[PDB]
């Protein structure tokens, strides 16, 4: 248990030799490996090397592997310095997670060389031209479709007479190929559930199929069924990174949506009632109950204000001041939080 | 709400049945219209202009052409014949103005010989000193008798009050006829009669005072 | 089904003021109106007057004057009234449920200068909040739903007295073969009209009833006459019920056969 | 007067001794204590540990106190010292004061068995499976309740043949037992009229009841009965952790509403008057009185914009534009101040 | 020279003795005064203090008259050191010009029996009871100046009949004699006529004097002299410390709402006239001109949005999207600039 | 293999010679320089200035060349310091590269006395007296040419008689003559037409000359060129340093621009669809179809709210509301984004 001083330029730094034999693969715990720094004139081993990231090297000894960086080191040098004294990989990882990066992660492949060879080429698009070609294809494969959707609806517009039968057709045939291609070859059928977007694909796809059973073989409740076609415009959150890091953010920040409908709700309730009681006895408008004037309180604080119903007196004039500054208050606050959290993950990208 | 005086239509016949009015009663588009058989209340044949009210056939159509609304049976059948109003509101919804009517008549009922009865007074009503000479006539179309009397073969005049003719239960009309007589010119002659005459045909009913039974 | 059954003083005499009462069960919990129809014989339909359930009467035009009609949640029942009765005001009065509902309280929120041709057609705010009068986003009805029977009120100074039935059966001669004829003789009664039945009901077979005639001393004449198969004659018992609603009169007079006790 | 020198590693901190028996009860100060970490050849109290974190510690003795934390020392690690230097537990608390951490709060219990019962029945509500049971049924009283003020007053809608009176008596119930048991359990009762909470609930149940002797024994007083009946929305306050952190930013961002209804009413006072002016003489809206536009000054400045009242002339448009870009301002200036309130009381839950 | 060597607690500093020389008066100036910490055992000085804020100190005197703070030691312990050391008070400026906290700009309370006692009373409020009185009726004065500048432009309302001109008069009188009061009471005069809020008194006193003057002897004179009456409210800003803080970021930021006017003018010239040439040749609104739709799109990109005018086409309504996109764009870019400078103003107070 | 012993007032430094010899020019490499400092009695060679700033400089030495800046040492002490030290320019500049200021660039000139006379005279207006003068005679004549733009539209406004075309003609020749001029005496012809602010010259000169010379010669291919007439008014650009910042601000950060367009399409898509089924078959306003609701959704998601089309059911009010609350979040997610990058160029002119 003999005290070793260990001299990092100049700066003298004694331990006990056991706080260092604990650890026996790093630069100081291999004594055929740290002889070459320690010169025997003084009985000091001198390392020229940067001062101030010597102390955080000493706590990892001293506090069984607890690693941190002072906060007057840079990232590159610490890094850096960490590698010097060899104090392992294992060492490393717990270094890079403290700063919080993601770099942790790997893909797996089918590596069958068939099934890696279709996977590779639909999964991953930058990889060869032919990949870089099926992606762009299947970006217009839904704006094509979502134009179909709108333009049915406008007013002038298995028979095949019509043309939005035999263009969602071919539509519904490529999502399709997309779909299968991408289950057979995949590495697992295990996480084939856990992408959403395997999910989203399987929602873009169905109500096009019990249609076509209707027919093959609910009046209004059809109409249910017509909307859910709306969930193609989520395809396009594949061949995008804009849209990811909103999923992302709406998915951490849940507790403050379930706050800001709550403070709306709570003013609707409370700012509502006021201006029923105030307008009670005049033509008011149509403040005839208190439930109506939910739709003019929800239009005054989120600053909409369309103009359909206003408030006639006097006491109505003044909880309708009051009404507009609550609500770009109760508006303000949760919001804050979740343009930090876009924040996060929009940066750390990089 | 003017209406003239009669119309005459027979069976399976079209009859636009004029209801000429203004536009504070036929622009409101909700006028009503009724039938009225003498005898009964009226019933409401049409209401709105062109809306049929429960009971209504849709073959009476309520065709309007302007301010003289019409009315059109396709195929007039057996019981339509009656008393038919026009009405409405006047320039408010809570009110109301009625017309005075017109008949609505329909030829083709069954024709047949008069089932006629005659009742001699009673025996009690010879005790009650009054003579009343029940003289009836039924099943009969037209609805046209001249109302007569017959003693022995002599005709009786005086004292005579008689019905219209009025319909029965089963397509056919009913009559009636009274020769309100004295108790002691009831008994002083030999034999009573009620000649009544129906298309021409004569069917006799004979009575007497001295007839037990 | 709105059953209307009318009940008051039918007889009544000059210059005292009318009252009858609709009975009114079956009483729809809808949007419509109670009033009285009246009719004189050989003229015309005429309306006399209403009341609603809020409280706002109307009535004919030519009428204001002469009518009251009032109104009974308690009861669920109409009534009716008239004043200066004379020889012209000889009417039977249906009372009857009529469907009425009506068409404008609508004015420019903002001055009219503003409201234009271009704003009414393109802006939804200002064409049916701010300016619906200038614009145009602001007629009448009548008809009945259900008729009454009627009650006959005729102005009088004189007495109303009763009938006087007597039986009347087929001859020996006046016999028409295997079906003969039968029937009652309601004489000398007031007012019009009297029904007569045949075994409370149970004898359709050819029942024959006639329109009544009118006497100058005052009094009404009708008969009756079924066909009957002559076989029967003596057998069942032939009972014609007269009814007179007045005077509360019931003759139960059965008619049997003739003989020569 | 004798010099004690420690070696923190290597480093060499020396000290009056003075300075270090000011406090016996202290690692150091104890001279039996501290005697183990001795070594007669240097002559030095030698101890293996954190190099940067013990120049605060000799501050301590130096000054007697005013513990204060190396801003690059992480608290877990300095938190780690004191306790090996014994520093003491009245020292630990100064700490965490200078950080402003608050741990101090505690709450008694009746604990007489059938009280302690009670009160851990009906206040904290995670301590069984009952007190669960009592919360959901109490969240769902409530919003019965507040489902029959709004439809009590839709235009459609003691003889107890009402079902609106009916369901509102047996809620009035509900509510006064839960009052009148916690009132009961309740440790000291000195404390019980002074929490806001308790005191929502006592406002609920007085509307109820005053009526109820009116009828048994006010024209638009009852009115305002009416409208202090609204207060029932606020007894999910306990059932919450959103509404209470709204009410403490509420509570300590006083100043900073004073001053946003006192900038916003100097400028109705100071647009409203030159838009008059200057639609002066012309057919101008309802701009008749000065009184009469400050409807307009709050739209425009708020930015609702109803457009039910517009300027027409060229001096009333460049004063409404002045007046949007000046509402703008005016509003964003002291709501950064309250919004930074929430934040920190929100996330001082951790 | 002479290498003095002073111990800080166990860390040698070394220096030349010339460079004490620098300031004779400090404590290492005078050799008497230092005289007393010298220890001739070791030859070297024990000033027993903070280790980690000696840097500076030894900075100061090398480079003859620098002085900064080191980042990881508090505003108390450091100006603790300043003092021990008597680095003079000129020296204790220097700190506080570094830190920037407030500096106390000179008190000149007069000096007189009486004349400095009346300066009191009404320059300074809370001295005592009196001059607090004196604030309470002062404020009460001008609520019914203001009111009575509503009230009489009203439609329904030297007559002496007349209440208006009566209850003005009383104020405007109460406004003459508080100003008499401290113009002659002012320890200077030429400072007087400097002071904003005495200017802001002679504009609110001088509109009513001068129609007197002119009424006991003006075509659009008497128009504007009506407008120049509005100013009796920003004498309200000398019992308020929460407008003075409102003129000193209007005064700071003069550059940064140029800008903001400046913004809004090119977008209202650049999308006004791309909807006039859009909507050119239908029954267009009124965009007849492109002078015309200067009023829609300050309305449209401020977002207040009356809805007096609209776009009707394709292109109009394409533009108009644009249109209010680029205003929330256009305004929150300079806005954050202001509101830092309030915050700066508002909490240096502290 | 020779430790050497820098010791920086009393903090002692020891090296291998041959990291002092890496660079020649520094005062350690060359031996003339350093043996001034040089005492023999102790073997160390002392210097007297800041301590805590050495380990930058030592570590430059030991890492070849990167130079650092540690975190608690101020910008002024730190260059100062590589200047004692005598380290070279490169490392001068690469301490500003390091840092984050952009000094490294000049300007060609003409070196000829009249190329360079009337280059000095246009573009660096704050020469002289003159250069002032064409500066301001520029600024007006700009204006000038937008205020004729806007009234030749007015309802009521080559044959002279015309003012408008004689005015348009004078700024037509001045910016003409303004061009030509700058164009001949520019040190270079190639870099001029890769810049900007000429090419706005160009682009606001040309169709004028292309209406004078087809005069003299399906919708007219004039009205497009009647729109590429207002881009006259960003020739302000070069007489503000307002509109310069706003240009590298809204090229910097395309991406977050494409996101704002991007986002508040798949909203507009998404909302529109859920009202027009919503109020589906009703007298339900003009959601005839659901490309008739994209007006709806862009008018209420950006708050602007005109009040033309609202919803008039319990669906379509439902929807409209969760409308409002979704745009007032995705517009406010890109933008803190775009406001930091205008800070950043903004204050970077310091
Ligand atoms: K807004
Ligand atoms: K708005
Ligand atoms: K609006």
């Not at chain 1, 909307?227 to 709406?250: D, E, N, P």
């Not at chain 1, 033509?283 to 239009?299: K, L, M, N, R």
């Not at chain 3, 145009?136 to 102005?155: A, I, K, M, P, S």
């Given at each position: 248990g003999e005290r070793v001083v260990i001299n990092i330029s100049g700066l003298r730094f004694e331990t006990q030799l056991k706080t260092l034999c604990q650890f026996p693969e790093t630069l100081l715990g291999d004594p055929k490996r740290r002889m070459r720094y320690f010169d025997p004139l003084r009985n000091e081993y001198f390392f020229d090397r940067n001062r101030p990231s010597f102390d955080a090297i000493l706590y990892y000894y001293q506090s069984g592997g607890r690693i941190r960086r002072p906060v007057n080191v840079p990232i590159d040098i610490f890094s850096e310095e960490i590698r010097f004294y060899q104090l392992g990989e294992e060492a490393m990882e717990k270094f890079r997670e403290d700063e919080g990066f993601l770099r942790e992660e790997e893909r797996p492949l089918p590596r069958r060389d068939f099934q890696r060879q279709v996977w590779l080429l639909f999964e991953y698009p930058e990889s060869s031209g032919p990949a870089r070609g099926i992606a762009i294809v299947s970006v217009l494969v839904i704006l094509i479709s979502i134009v179909i959707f709108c333009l049915?609806?406008?007013?002038?517009?298995?028979?095949?007479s019509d043309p939005f039968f035999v263009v969602e057709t071919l539509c519904i045939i490529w999502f399709s190929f997309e779909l299968l291609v991408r289950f057979f070859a995949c590495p697992s059928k295990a996480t084939f559930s856990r992408?959403?977007?395997?999910?989203?694909?399987?929602?873009?796809?169905?109500?096009?199929?019990?249609?076509?059973?209707?027919?093959?073989?609910?009046?209004?409740?059809?109409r249910v069924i017509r909307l859910v076609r709306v969930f193609r415009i989520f395809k396009l959150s594949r061949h995008s990174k804009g849209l990811q890091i909103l999923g992302q953010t709406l998915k951490a920040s849940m507790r403050e949506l379930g706050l800001l409908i709550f403070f709306l709700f709570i003013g609707v309730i409370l700012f509502s009632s006021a201006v029923y009681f105030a307008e009670a006895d005049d033509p008011t408008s149509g403040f005839s109950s208190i439930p109506d004037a939910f739709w003019w309180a929800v239009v005054t604080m989120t600053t909409v204000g369309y103009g359909d119903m206003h408030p006639v007196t006097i006491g109505g004039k003044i909880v309708g001041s009051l009404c507009a500054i609550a609500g770009v208050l109760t508006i303000a606050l949760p919001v804050p939080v979740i343009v930090s959290?876009?924040?996060?993950?929009?940066?750390r990208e990089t | 709400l003017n209406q003239p005086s009669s119309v005459s239509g027979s069976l399976g016949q079209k009859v636009t049945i004029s209801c000429s009015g203004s536009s504070s009663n036929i622009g409101n588009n909700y006028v009503s219209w009724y039938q009225q058989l003498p005898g009964t209340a009226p019933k409401l044949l049409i209401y709105g202009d062109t809306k049929r009210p429960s009971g209504i056939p849709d073959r009476f159509?309520?065709?309007?052409?302007?301010?003289?609304?019409?009315?059109?049976?396709?195929?007039?059948?057996?019981?339509?014949?009656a008393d038919y109003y026009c009405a409405s509101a006047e320039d408010s919804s809570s009110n109301a103005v009625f017309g005075s009517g017109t008949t609505l008549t329909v030829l083709g009922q069954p024709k047949a010989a008069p089932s006629v009865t005659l009742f001699p007074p009673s025996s009690?009503?010879?005790?009650?000193?009054?003579?009343?000479?029940?003289?009836?006539?039924?099943?009969?179309?037209?609805?046209?008798?001249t109302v007569a009397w017959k003693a022995d073969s002599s005709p009786v005049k005086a004292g005579v009050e008689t019905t219209t003719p009025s319909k029965q239960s089963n397509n056919k009309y009913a009559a009636s006829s009274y020769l309100s007589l004295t108790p002691e010119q009831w008994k002083s002659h030999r034999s009573y009669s009620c000649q009544v005459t129906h298309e021409g045909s004569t069917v006799e009913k004979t009575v007497a005072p001295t007839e037990c039974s | 089904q709105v059953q209307l059954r009318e009940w008051g003083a039918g007889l009544l005499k000059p210059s005292e003021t009318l009252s009858l009462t609709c009975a009114v069960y079956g009483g729809s919990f809808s949007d419509k109106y109670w009033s009285w129809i009246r009719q004189p014989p050989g003229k015309g339909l005429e309306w006399i007057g209403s009341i609603n359930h809020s409280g706002s009467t109307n009535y004919n035009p030519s009428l204001k004057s002469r009518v009251t009609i009032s109104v009974d949640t308690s009861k669920n029942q109409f009534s009716l009234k008239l004043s200066s009765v004379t020889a012209a005001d000889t009417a039977v009065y249906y009372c009857t449920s009529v469907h009425q509902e009506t068409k404008r309280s609508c004015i420019d929120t903002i001055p009219k200068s503003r409201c234009t041709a271009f704003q009414c057609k393109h802006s939804m705010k200002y064409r049916?909040?701010?300016?619906?009068?200038?614009?145009?986003?602001?007629?009448?009805?009548?008809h009945v739903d259900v008729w009454g029977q009627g009650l006959l009120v005729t102005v009088s100074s004189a007495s109303t007295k009763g009938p006087s039935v007597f039986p009347l059966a087929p001859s020996s001669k006046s016999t028409s073969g295997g079906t003969a004829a039968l029937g009652c003789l309601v004489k000398d009664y007031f007012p019009e009209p009297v029904?007569?039945?045949?075994?409370?009901?149970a004898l359709t077979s050819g029942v024959h009833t006639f329109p009544a005639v009118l006497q100058s001393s005052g009094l009404y004449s009708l008969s009756s006459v079924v066909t009957v198969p002559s076989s029967s004659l003596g057998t069942q018992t032939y009972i014609c019920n007269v009814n007179h609603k007045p005077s509360n009169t019931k003759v139960d007079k059965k008619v049997e056969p003739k003989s020569c006790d």
């Amino acid at each position: 248990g003999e005290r070793v001083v260990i001299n990092i330029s100049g700066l003298r730094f004694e331990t006990q030799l056991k706080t260092l034999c604990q650890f026996p693969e790093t630069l100081l715990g291999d004594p055929k490996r740290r002889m070459r720094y320690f010169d025997p004139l003084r009985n000091e081993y001198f390392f020229d090397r940067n001062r101030p990231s010597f102390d955080a090297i000493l706590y990892y000894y001293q506090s069984g592997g607890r690693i941190r960086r002072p906060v007057n080191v840079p990232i590159d040098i610490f890094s850096e310095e960490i590698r010097f004294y060899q104090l392992g990989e294992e060492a490393m990882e717990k270094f890079r997670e403290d700063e919080g990066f993601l770099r942790e992660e790997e893909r797996p492949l089918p590596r069958r060389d068939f099934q890696r060879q279709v996977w590779l080429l639909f999964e991953y698009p930058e990889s060869s031209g032919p990949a870089r070609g099926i992606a762009i294809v299947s970006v217009l494969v839904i704006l094509i479709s979502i134009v179909i959707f709108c333009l049915e609806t406008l007013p002038e517009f298995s028979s095949f007479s019509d043309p939005f039968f035999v263009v969602e057709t071919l539509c519904i045939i490529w999502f399709s190929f997309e779909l299968l291609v991408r289950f057979f070859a995949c590495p697992s059928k295990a996480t084939f559930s856990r992408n959403i977007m395997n999910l989203i694909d399987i929602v873009a796809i169905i109500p096009y199929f019990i249609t076509l059973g209707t027919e093959l073989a609910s009046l209004a409740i059809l109409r249910v069924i017509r909307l859910v076609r709306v969930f193609r415009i989520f395809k396009l959150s594949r061949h995008s990174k804009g849209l990811q890091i909103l999923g992302q953010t709406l998915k951490a920040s849940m507790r403050e949506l379930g706050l800001l409908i709550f403070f709306l709700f709570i003013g609707v309730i409370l700012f509502s009632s006021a201006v029923y009681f105030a307008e009670a006895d005049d033509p008011t408008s149509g403040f005839s109950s208190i439930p109506d004037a939910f739709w003019w309180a929800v239009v005054t604080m989120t600053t909409v204000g369309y103009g359909d119903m206003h408030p006639v007196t006097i006491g109505g004039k003044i909880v309708g001041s009051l009404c507009a500054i609550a609500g770009v208050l109760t508006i303000a606050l949760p919001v804050p939080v979740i343009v930090s959290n876009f924040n996060y993950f929009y940066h750390r990208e990089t | 709400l003017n209406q003239p005086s009669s119309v005459s239509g027979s069976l399976g016949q079209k009859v636009t049945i004029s209801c000429s009015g203004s536009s504070s009663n036929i622009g409101n588009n909700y006028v009503s219209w009724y039938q009225q058989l003498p005898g009964t209340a009226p019933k409401l044949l049409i209401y709105g202009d062109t809306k049929r009210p429960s009971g209504i056939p849709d073959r009476f159509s309520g065709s309007k052409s302007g301010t003289s609304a019409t009315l059109g049976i396709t195929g007039l059948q057996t019981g339509d014949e009656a008393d038919y109003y026009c009405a409405s509101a006047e320039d408010s919804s809570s009110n109301a103005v009625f017309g005075s009517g017109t008949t609505l008549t329909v030829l083709g009922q069954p024709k047949a010989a008069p089932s006629v009865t005659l009742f001699p007074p009673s025996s009690e009503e010879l005790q009650a000193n009054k003579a009343t000479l029940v003289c009836l006539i039924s099943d009969f179309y037209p609805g046209a008798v001249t109302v007569a009397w017959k003693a022995d073969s002599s005709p009786v005049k005086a004292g005579v009050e008689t019905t219209t003719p009025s319909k029965q239960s089963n397509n056919k009309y009913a009559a009636s006829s009274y020769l309100s007589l004295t108790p002691e010119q009831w008994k002083s002659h030999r034999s009573y009669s009620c000649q009544v005459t129906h298309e021409g045909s004569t069917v006799e009913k004979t009575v007497a005072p001295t007839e037990c039974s | 089904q709105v059953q209307l059954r009318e009940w008051g003083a039918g007889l009544l005499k000059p210059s005292e003021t009318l009252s009858l009462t609709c009975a009114v069960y079956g009483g729809s919990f809808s949007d419509k109106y109670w009033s009285w129809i009246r009719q004189p014989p050989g003229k015309g339909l005429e309306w006399i007057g209403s009341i609603n359930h809020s409280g706002s009467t109307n009535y004919n035009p030519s009428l204001k004057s002469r009518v009251t009609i009032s109104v009974d949640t308690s009861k669920n029942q109409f009534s009716l009234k008239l004043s200066s009765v004379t020889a012209a005001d000889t009417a039977v009065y249906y009372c009857t449920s009529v469907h009425q509902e009506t068409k404008r309280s609508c004015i420019d929120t903002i001055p009219k200068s503003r409201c234009t041709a271009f704003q009414c057609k393109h802006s939804m705010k200002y064409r049916l909040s701010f300016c619906r009068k200038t614009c145009g986003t602001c007629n009448y009805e009548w008809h009945v739903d259900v008729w009454g029977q009627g009650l006959l009120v005729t102005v009088s100074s004189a007495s109303t007295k009763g009938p006087s039935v007597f039986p009347l059966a087929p001859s020996s001669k006046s016999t028409s073969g295997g079906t003969a004829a039968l029937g009652c003789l309601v004489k000398d009664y007031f007012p019009e009209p009297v029904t007569v039945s045949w075994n409370s009901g149970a004898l359709t077979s050819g029942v024959h009833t006639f329109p009544a005639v009118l006497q100058s001393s005052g009094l009404y004449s009708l008969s009756s006459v079924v066909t009957v198969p002559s076989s029967s004659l003596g057998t069942q018992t032939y009972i014609c019920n007269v009814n007179h609603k007045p005077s509360n009169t019931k003759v139960d007079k059965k008619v049997e056969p003739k003989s020569c006790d």
